Amino acid sequence: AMALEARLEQASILKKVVDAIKDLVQDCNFDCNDSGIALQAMDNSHVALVSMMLKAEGFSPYRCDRNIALGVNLTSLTKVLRAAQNEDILTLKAEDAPDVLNLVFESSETDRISEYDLKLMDIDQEHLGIPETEYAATITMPSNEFKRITTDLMAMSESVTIEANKDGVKFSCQGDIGNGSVTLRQHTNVEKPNESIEIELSEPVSLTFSLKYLVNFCKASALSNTVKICLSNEVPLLVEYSLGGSSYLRFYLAPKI
C-alpha cells in the first residue's frame, strides 16, 4: 500500500488547476501531507507566486501516510492529464521518496482504464512565507468579467493601474492609441450573486501591474465563478480563486515600481 493514494470523483478539477498554472510554471513540487495536496512556485520569470491547495476533503478518499514532495514538469504532467476525460475517476498514487507518480483514469462511459507512470524530477525550491496582510482594498467580482477586462486592456497597453477608492475600483491604461479605463462599482445582484461587485475599502490605494501576468492568472477563470483581487501598498497583488471548501488557487503579482 503506497504512501499516497488520492482519489478524485472527477478528473476535471485537477485538469483545470494544472491548466491554470502550466503557462506560468515550468516545474514544481506538489507537497502532499495529511491536509491535502499543495503547490507553491514562482513563475518562470520570478514576477509572481502561485499558491495552491487541494484539501483532503475534496478527494474521495484521500490518504497520505507520510509527507511526499512530487517533483513534476508541468508540460509532462499535461501530456498525461490530457488523457483523462473530465468525467473520469482519477487516482494519484506514489511510494515514499517516489521515482514516478502513478495516475489511473477510469472512464465513466465505457470499460476503459488509463494508467500512467510519470517520471518525477528532483526540484530544489525554498518555501516562501506568505504573511498575514490586511489589504487596503479588495474587490470580489465575476471571474469572466475580470478575464475580459484584463485581456481587452492588454490589446492597448502592457501596464494597468488599479486604483481603489470611494468611487469604486478603476483599471486604467495609457498607450499609443489613447487611454482606457474600466470602473467597477459596489453592486448587488439578488438573483445572480456571482455578478455582484463587493468592494471592501480600508484605505485608498493605487498600484500598477503587468497585464500579461493578470491575463495568465485568468486561465483559472473556469475554476471559480468569482475572483477576489486584493491591493495594498508595499505588497504584491493577490488574485484569489477560492474553490469549494477551503481549497484555493492564488496568484501574487509583484507591482511595477
Binding site: 520570478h46 514576477v47 525554498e126 516562501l128 504584491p236 501574487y252 509583484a254 507591482p255 515600481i257
Partner: peptide
C-alpha cells in the same frame, strides 16, 4: 520597471 517577487516574501 517590474519588481521581482522574491523581495516581498521571506524564506522558510
Amino acid at each position: 520597471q517590474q519588481a521581482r517577487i522574491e523581495g516581498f516574501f521571506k524564506v522558510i
